Design a protein around this ligand. Structure first.
Ligand code: HEC
Length: 100
């Protein structure tokens, strides 16, 4: 299931650290992350294994990192446990395509 309205309720788990619309808080601003370069917001300083990772945030790279972030990038400052169900990750990735 890839629904952007159910992805807005799943993004309430992200809202306290991350704000979509230009504003960088505890994490960076997430407007248009689907396809965006790893360590790409010039303005937010990232972790050293996040800067050394490379490539882009594709829908499989976002599904692996949102399943467990500190197992995928060993030494990221993202203090989030994980989304185990596919519908929560796929609904959220449809909302992050909706806000490009
Ligand atoms: C605060 C406790 C966070 C929560 C809750 C979530 N994330 Fe976060 N995110 C946070 C930080 C501090 C960072 C930077 C990590 C680093 O190593 O520098 C991040 C990063 C992401 C990223 C990468 C973005 C990029 O521009 O490279 C993504 C894709 C990301 N976080 C997504 C995300 C989502 C969708 C969350 C809710 C399910 C989520 N984060 C929660 C801090 C926190």
């Amino acid at each position: 299931m890839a629904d952007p309205a159910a992805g807005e309720k799943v993004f309430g788990k992200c809202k306290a650290c991350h704000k979509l619309d230009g504003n960088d808080g505890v994490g960076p601003h997430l407007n248009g992350v689907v396809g965006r370069t790893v360590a790409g917001v010039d303005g937010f300083n990232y972790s050293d294994p996040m800067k050394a990772h490379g490539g882009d945030w594709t829908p499989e790279a976002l599904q692996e990192f949102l399943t467990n972030p500190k197992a995928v990038v060993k030494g990221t400052k993202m203090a989030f446990a994980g989304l185990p169900k596919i519908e929560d990750r796929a609904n959220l990735i449809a909302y992050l395509e909706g806000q490009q």
